[PDB]
Amino acid sequence: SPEFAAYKVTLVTPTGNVEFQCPDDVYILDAAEEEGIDLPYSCRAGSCSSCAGKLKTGSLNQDDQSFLDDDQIDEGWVLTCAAYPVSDVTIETHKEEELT
Numbered sequence: 001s002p003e004f005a006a007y008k009v010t011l012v013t014p015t016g017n018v019e020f021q022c023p024d025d026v027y028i029l030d031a032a033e034e035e036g037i038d039l040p041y042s043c044r045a046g047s048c049s050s051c052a053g054k055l056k057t058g059s060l061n062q063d064d065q066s067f068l069d070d071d072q073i074d075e076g077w078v079l080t081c082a083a084y085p086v087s088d089v090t091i092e093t094h095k096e097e098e099l100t
């Protein structure tokens, strides 16, 4: 497997869709911000609802998140501040209200 890689992230946001390359060692949130995208957050530590999204295709590593339970992870919930892509992914953002 490659020492380093980047994956195509498609974010489906309330103001439109955007795509960018995310390094496999950068969280979705941080990579979005580098591209000038404003995404919701507060704690940036994987322990709250602020940065919630829904995974629509592809795979994430969310080992660094703790607030979502195993059923919520199975349902496709994502804490964008604590998730790394391991494939190209599509995430629908700004989902805190739906999650909670």
Ligand code: FES
Pocket: 040, 041, 042, 043, 044, 045, 046, 047, 048, 049, 050, 051, 052, 067, 079, 080, 081, 082
């Ligand atoms: S901003 Fe709190 S879990 Fe992501």
